[PDB]
Structures are given as structure tokens and as C-alpha cells.
Amino acid sequence: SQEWKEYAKRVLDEWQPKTKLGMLVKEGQITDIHEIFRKGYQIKEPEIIDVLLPEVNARENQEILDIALTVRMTDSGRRVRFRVLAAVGNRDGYVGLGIGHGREVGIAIRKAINYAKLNIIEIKRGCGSWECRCRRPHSVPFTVEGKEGSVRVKLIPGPRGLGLVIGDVGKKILRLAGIQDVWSQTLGETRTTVNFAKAVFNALYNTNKVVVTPEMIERYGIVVGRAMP
RNA sequence: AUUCCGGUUGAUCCUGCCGGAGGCCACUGCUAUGGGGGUCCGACUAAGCCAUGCGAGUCAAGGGGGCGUCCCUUCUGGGACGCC
Ligand SMILES: [Mg+2]
Ligand SMILES: [Mg+2]
Ligand SMILES: [Mg+2]
Ligand SMILES: [Mg+2]
Ligand SMILES: [Zn+2]
């Protein structure tokens, strides 16, 4: 944590904002990550996340989900292009997913990491399993669903210490968001990695669309964003 | 662990089947130091055919006999005892 404080301080001083939200962050009128959500702002400068969530630059908080090469046909042969699917998170409450293209692998990786920061979202965590009622944010608070392409994903709460009972892509994405235990069910073509990742991402996002009462927050130990001990 | 991964195109998304990865049972290649426990070993084809030995006896306190050893007298005998 000590490295990232000074890293954010270094980034803040030499950064020239170009947008309104960047100006708000630069002048110190916005000081917390949670204050840029749920008000319709547009996020176009990656430095905002670097200042407010510096730990997404750690090597352990980034994941290269997949790499593919695609071909365009021309009378002078085949033109090759790289597509990279990547994800980032702070392992507490925030996660982002991105896609980048480039003529060579390094450019595509850089752009994919860059776009993941701009698509960052915050989720809700809790414990809602029938056989584990512990009020601790180690799983999803209730059953959620998502879909993309032909892939349908359903996430079910699990007991503490169970593990992530899901394919590897889902494992990585859920780990980056700070979830330890879950059950799952799927339909469709999971071997299409992009759609699988997007479906898991949408299922995580849909935790904000479920109406809840103040009693439920106490009952399931629902936490929004950072756990904040 | 309420799970996926490879395969149809110059490249993409689907439907759909094949293969991989797990457990148990029967036969089998190569190779093997020790102990304990258990309801394991000619069932699948032939409920096909069988040399040899064994796998159902017991009762002397139900009854007349045979044989043997002893005691009493014994010509003769009567007892007791033990086998058949
Ligand atoms: Mg031409
Ligand atoms: Mg759609
Ligand atoms: Mg075809
Ligand atoms: Mg026979
Ligand atoms: Zn729990």
C-alpha cells in the first residue's frame, strides 16, 4: 500500500486533465473512488482510476484472459491482427473488463489494459447460502444471472471455504472482484471466451438491480464497494 | 468442485455429434519387501462328462446270542468284566 500512495502522488502532480471529471479529481473536490459512480458521469481519462485506485497497476491485480489472431483477406495476402481480452480489479469491490486490438501483441495488451480501467464497476457482496449464514462478504448475496451471445450464466451463493465452482475464466474474474465461494450453472457455448467473460461480468453487474430492504442488509451482511473493517 | 477443454472457416458466431479428463467391475502386458482385517476365487461358454477317497449316524439302562479274562464252588454251573 505504501508504494501505491507515492505512485498516486507522483501521477497526480504531472497530470494535465482534459475533461470535467479529471478537473474535479485534480483540484481535490473528489477524494474517494465511490464518488464517481451513480451520477451519469463519463469516464474518458485513465489517470482518474490511477489516482483513486492505484493498486490496479499491481501485477497480481491484472489478468490476461485470452489472446487471439484474426485474418483479413486481400489480393496481396493475409493481414493479421491481434485481439487481447484482459481484466483488472482491486480484489475488494471493483472490477473492469476490456478488449484491445493491435498490429503486434504488446500494443494490443497495452490497449486492452487501458480499456479495462475505463469500464470499471462496483458490486455488492454478502452471504446468502442456506447452509452458511455468517454475514461476511465472501460470496454473492443472492442468486444472479447474466448473458451474452449464446452464453447464459447463473451464480448461486456458496458456503465459506467451498471454493469457486466455475470455469477458469469465471474463476479469474470473480477472484479479481473479491469473491471466494460460489456455485454456478451455464448454458450455451462456453468455449467462446469473450462471451463467457462478458456474461460473468454482466451477472456481477446485475447485483445492483435487485431491490432490497434494510432488514436484508443486516441479514446477509451486504457490503457495497470496499469492506472497510 | 452444482466445472469444462480439442475438432467444420482465409477469419467469426451458432446448431450438432465425436474425442479427452473421473469412479467401479471382468480379462490381460511388465514388475513386486512386510504385517493385519473381511461376507473374495469353474457364476458368464458346457444344469457338459466323471477314475479314486471321504460328505449320516447313534443307543449295552429295549432283547436273546457268540468270544475272551477272572472269583466262588466247580464233573455240571453261577457270577463279574470287556469286545462283536
Ligand atoms: Mg485487388
Ligand atoms: Mg444479444
Ligand atoms: Mg461451414
Ligand atoms: Mg459347469
Ligand atoms: Zn457464509
Curated annotation (Swiss-Prot):
GO terms for biological process: translation. GO terms for molecular function: rRNA binding; structural constituent of ribosome. The keyword Cell wall biogenesis/degradation does not apply. GO terms for cellular component: cytosolic small ribosomal subunit. Residues 60-123 form the S5 DRBM domain. It holds the Pfam family Ribosomal_S5_C. Keywords: Ribonucleoprotein, Ribosomal protein, RNA-binding, rRNA-binding. InterPro entries: Ribosomal_Su5_D2-typ_SF (IPR020568), Ribosomal_uS5 (IPR000851), Ribosomal_uS5_arc (IPR047866), Ribosomal_uS5_C (IPR005324), Ribosomal_uS5_euk/arc (IPR005711), Ribosomal_uS5_N (IPR013810), Ribosomal_uS5_N_CS (IPR018192), Ribsml_uS5_D2-typ_fold_subgr (IPR014721). Belongs to the universal ribosomal protein uS5 family. With S4 and S12 plays an important role in translational accuracy. Part of the 30S ribosomal subunit. Contacts protein S4. The N-terminal domain interacts with the head of the 30S subunit; the C-terminal domain interacts with the body and contacts protein S4. The interaction surface between S4 and S5 is involved in control of translational fidelity. This is Small ribosomal subunit protein uS5. It comes from Pyrococcus abyssi (strain GE5 / Orsay). The lineage of its organism: Archaea, Methanobacteriati, Methanobacteriota, Thermococci, Thermococcales. The gene is rps5.
